[PDB]
Amino acid sequence: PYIQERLKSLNDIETQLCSMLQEASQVTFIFGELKRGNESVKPQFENHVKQFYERLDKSTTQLRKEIQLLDENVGTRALGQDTEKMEEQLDLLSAILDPSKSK
Amino acid sequence: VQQLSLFGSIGDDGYDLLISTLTTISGNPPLLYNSLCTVWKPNPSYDVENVNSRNQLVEPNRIKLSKEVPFSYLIDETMMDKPLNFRILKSFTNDKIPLNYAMTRNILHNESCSPWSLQISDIPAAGNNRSVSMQTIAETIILSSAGKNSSVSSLMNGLGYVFEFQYLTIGVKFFMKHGLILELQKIWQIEEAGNSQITSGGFLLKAYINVSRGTDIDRINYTETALMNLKKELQGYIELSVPDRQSMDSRVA
Amino acid sequence: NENGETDDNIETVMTQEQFVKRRRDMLEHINLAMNESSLALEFVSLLLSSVKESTGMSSMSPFLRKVVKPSSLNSDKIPYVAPTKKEYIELDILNKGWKLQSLNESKDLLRASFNKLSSILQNEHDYWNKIMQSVIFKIRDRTSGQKLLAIKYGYEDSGSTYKHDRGIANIRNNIESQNLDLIPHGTDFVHSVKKFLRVRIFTKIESEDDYILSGESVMDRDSESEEAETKDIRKQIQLLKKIIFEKELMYQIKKECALLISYGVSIENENKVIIELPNEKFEIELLSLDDDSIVNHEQDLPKINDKRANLMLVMLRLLLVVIFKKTLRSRISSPHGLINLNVDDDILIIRPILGKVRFANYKLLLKKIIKDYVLDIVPGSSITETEVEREQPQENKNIDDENITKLNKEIRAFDKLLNIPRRELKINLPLTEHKSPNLSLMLESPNYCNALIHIKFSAGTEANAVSFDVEDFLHFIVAEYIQQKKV
């Protein structure tokens, strides 16, 4: 089905969230260097920092959006017996044809 | 026979969905069917008391002749063609199949006649709050006819009845558990001055079970339950309810 | 992803000593702080001075036995000044930056193992992708009826009814593969052990020499090597088709039962062997225990019996698709439903019963009738056989239909296959001209029992005729016919 697309959009939003983590983890160790007085990477600190904010805001819009979509999909509109019953024949019949002549 | 039933309706909008749903609930496809019903009243020229040779208070009522019309006498276009009843019903909405239905009432298109379902029903069971519509029906099958005036119309006149009004219904029915039937239907008034769809806008929904007994309170009570379960299962999607009794009384009126 | 995050949130573990010692750590290291918060409850008795103070005091059982209100203080607001104003206090606030720093060092460390912990969860993202690639039956088990364990999946039989133990049930492993449960048929990802239906036909000839029998078996093996790849429901769709075949063998169990109505082999009630008299031969098998269970060496040689035998399986298999079909005729068609299977073993008998009949009976008997018609081999004569009896009843794929358009289609489907199921002997006739006479005979199988009912008219200016409906009498009737023929 073509929803497998929307499914992959969310599984990727999932990787975005694991980035919210991965990114803010640097924010943790980098602010470690920063209050240690060694203003060495203060610009780099600012970078990965607005980056943790960025990843989660993108995730926030992306899954929030996905939820909006699912609500929209929701707004939008035994199977066993059917095909199986007939198809019986189709396989056995085609195979009975096959053993009668071939190649 | 006892007919316990629940009614409701859906706009043509809801049909597509309802269908997909009903197929899953029942596990059978909907099956396309139709039927014409011709209603007869006692000849208003004759006049009769309301009592028997066995002093019984007996009221005048209408008779209902019902049968299938093969679709060949009903359908507007082959292009539509196909086997699918729901997409086909949109094709049928608002207006009539060939009809002019008089023709068939007296043969045509030197003749004998078909089989009919000859019925007479009583008002649904008096009840302060019924969980289900319970209605009695007297029926006989006419197999064919014989004699001078063997057209169904002659026959009815011979018996002292007169044609009153008629209607065609086309729909799909679902065959289901413990004799439960679901009909999703459309009804068309048939007169000589043209045909109009009574159900224009949507489908009449009827879920029912005809019970042989009446006098087996148990199977009657089982049947109530069946219908209840259905209404209940679909509750929050469609309400199946008991129609007003007064609205199911085929008496003089 | 959610399930896997919920798994990590189930405390769950199978650790010996590893899991054991760790939880003991929690006990003692937590208990310490619990116990030291009790020194905190002892400062409560330390109030004394008030009744509400006594209340707080009884907190220790030893307070219950240490009556006194005991302690007292004075004023060193000066010492509060010293705490706050000391160069030591300025310095101590450095112990605040120091512990806080090492806390931030901890924080950094925790944060990084988190993204790598989300990385084991990307194994799952892949599993979901695998599931995205490649029935919506919704079930609940482990009883209770509310909560407990609840999930969803498809199964096999559907329209028309074998009856017992028939379905399918499906769940996902941590290897991103789906395991196929059956609600019995006991789980083994795309099955554990499978029995295909199988077949096998023996012939015992020897040119009527030493009673030596060999077989030959039409074999159904797609392969022994199995793929149904993990993370692939498309391969699982293939496994689902395999599941369908397994459900089909259950059908051959119904045919087993349908044997029970015949006098041809069912030995000890523990095994049943399909077999028939002529040329003594045997055809197909599957023990009252089962059908086809897999374990053998594999070499390719064929054999004439083997080729024929593959024809049997498809027929026998086919024949109960018929049953699987005329069941559904009734169901779709009329109120009650079809449930409970083959009363009179009329419906049942069709499977494996009418094939056996067919092969054996009509054929051997026709052959035998032909030798009897060699007893009428005497006159110059002539005599011919048709499908004429067959033509007269049981027409194939007719436009007529039944009650309905929907109904008509299925009826039609039945009919052409219905030739096979109907297979009684057609019958035959012979005739003479010159002031002209005529006779005729029909072979009827009723369940492998053979009737030969004949007719005969000698057409001339004034008519004379007789018709008669046992093989002993047939021989005799032929002898009487020679006399009343020309001669």
Place this chain on the structure above:
Amino acid sequence: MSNQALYEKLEQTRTILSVKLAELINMTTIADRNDDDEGSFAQENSELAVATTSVMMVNNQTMQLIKNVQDLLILTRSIKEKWLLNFDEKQIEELLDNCIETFVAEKTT
């Protein structure tokens, strides 16, 4: 319905927003921020308890942050689940069956 389910997710998102901020801001306070200015209203006075703020921050903020994450990954895959909730026709065949019958059954004509 779907609405109520989402509301929770939105709340979780708001929670996730409000705690890396507390980890950052409380970092200042944890590092100790004693003010010559009298107006500033953050305190870290007493020994144990003011560096205890640092031990609580660790468990609180870091697990609230990571927790908002764990709950939000549940939220995600929950919606995913929600979405995964979801020949020889003719008499021609009569001929075929006759072929098989003659084939399997004996006699050579």
